[PDB]
């Protein structure tokens, strides 16, 4: 039974360093493949393996390696680290016999290489109350949510009402914004909306907070600059209902 | 080894029955499938056609297959915004062992919903906490619309995004904006 399991999901690095993307299977399957497709593009296998101890590669110009030491794991890894690099990695597998099946599922790696890292930033979040225009025209009532001034383009939203994370009447932007473009290592900015009905959002007991969390540094890394050390964490705004 | 789709962008609106084909040139076939990979994530086994026809129903899903094999269609019928995705064509020189599966660059899918009582504006949101910043929402506009970027260094300025109230049975699309203060007002903001 189970599916795949990759690991990290997110994860910031400084060039020069050893990375070790790794990812597991308990279905047995001996066809391990491993794509990467850089942002705006399609997959690219660059390694593949039939079982243990074979390793193959799809595009010749690769530059990381992998290890099928155990039909369980097919950890690919990356020497030194290279901006170069910066994209997504998705781990695959496929069925044994008969009509081949395969299922990648691997949720993917999402890799950042930062030239040196103190261009590392968390996200400033803010919620604003709907405009009491839109509710008496309208009668419902819209929240957005600011993720600001945070990079690597790495985070999760979520709002969570009265205690509970809530999808329905909620979007948010399927690609962050960059504030300062002219920078390819420019911080990024998010938003996300919210709707309800009016006389809910008029009821002081309802609870609004919107959630967001950030995949930064691990405590381990160095960190020495005048500000408190960019770790994955998680930031938080929240809002209440109010008649007025 | 040559593995081509189309189209290779499209969209279109819910309850829509749309179908889109595949090409190739590859020696020897055996399995033919269909994936659905969504942004930022990893594709999804829809469907694996064999020697066997040009029909294989997955719900709302359908394949066909060549006769000769030369090229298939995926046939989806009512069509629903969770479905607008990127979706790949995957071919394999047979061998459940000693096969290798060619993907198409795949053509991203878009689904809008559909637009009835419109209603467009935008307002002016205040902060929560006490502070003097603020941001512009347009919302209730047809799909048609098109959200111009800013394009104005200082402002921000994010494509439309749509969010559906179940419980009302109700979509709505919407952009938002924001910028520093200054010579900001929502009249000028979201200008063509």
């Known amino acids: 039974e189970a599916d795949i399991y990759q690991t990290p999901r997110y994860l910031v690095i400084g060039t020069g360093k050893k990375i070790t993307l790794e990812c597991s299977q308990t279905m047995g399957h001996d066809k391990m493949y491993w794509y990467q497709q850089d942002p705006g593009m399609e997959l690219h296998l660059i390694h593949y393996?039939?079982?243990?101890?074979?390793?193959e590669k799809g595009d010749l110009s690769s530059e990381s390696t992998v290890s099928r030491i155990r039909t369980e794991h097919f950890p690919l890894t990356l020497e030194s680290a290279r901006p170069s690099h910066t994209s997504q990695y998705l781990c695959?597998?496929?069925?044994?016999?008969?009509?081949?099946?395969?299922?990648?599922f691997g949720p993917g790696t999402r890799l950042t290489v930062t030239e040196d890292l103190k261009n590392v930033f968390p996200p400033e979040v803010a919620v604003f109350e709907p405009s009491e225009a839109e509710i008496s025209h309208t009668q419902k009532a819209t929240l957005v949510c600011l993720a600001t001034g945070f990079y690597p383009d790495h985070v999760e939203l979520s709002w969570w009402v009265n205690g509970k994370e809530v999808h329905s009447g909620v979007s948010t932007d399927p690609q962050p914004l960059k504030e300062q473009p002219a920078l390819n290592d420019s911080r990024y900015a998010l938003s996300s909306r919210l709707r309800v009905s009016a006389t809910f959002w008029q009821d002081p007991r309802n609870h609004f907070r919107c959630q967001v969390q950030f995949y930064g540094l691990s405590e381990n890394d160095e960190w020495t600059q005048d500000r408190a050390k960019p770790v994955t964490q998680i930031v938080s705004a929240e809002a209440w209902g109010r008649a007025d | 080894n040559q593995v081509e789709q189309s189209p290779q962008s499209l969209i279109i609106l819910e309850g829509k029955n749309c179908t889109l084909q595949?090409?190739?040139?590859?020696?020897?076939?055996?399995?033919l499938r269909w994936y659905k990979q969504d942004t930022g994530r990893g594709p999804v086994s829809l469907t694996i056609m064999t020697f066997s026809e040009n029909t294989k129903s997955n719900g709302r899903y359908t394949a066909t297959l060549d006769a000769d094999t030369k090229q298939s269609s995926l046939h989806i019928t009512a069509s629903q915004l969770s479905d607008s995705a990127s979706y790949i064509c995957?071919?394999?020189?047979?061998?459940?062992?000693?096969?290798?599966?060619?993907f198409g660059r795949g053509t991203q899918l878009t689904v809008w919903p559909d637009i009835q009582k419109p209603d467009p504006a935008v307002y002016q949101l205040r902060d929560s906490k006490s502070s003097d910043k603020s941001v512009c929402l347009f919302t209730d506009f047809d799909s048609q619309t098109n959200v111009s970027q800013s394009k104005d260094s200082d402002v921000y300025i994010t494509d439309k995004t749509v969010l559906d109230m179940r419980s009302m049975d109700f979509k709505s699309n919407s952009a938002v904006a924001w910028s520093n203060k200054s010579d900001f007002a929502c009249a000028n903001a979201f200008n063509n």
């Open positions: 595949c090409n190739y040139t590859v020696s020897p076939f055996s399995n």
């Open positions: 393996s039939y079982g243990v101890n074979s390793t």
């Open positions: 995957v071919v394999s020189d047979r061998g459940s062992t000693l096969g290798r599966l060619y």
């Open positions: 695959a597998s496929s069925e044994n016999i008969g009509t081949a099946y395969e299922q990648y």
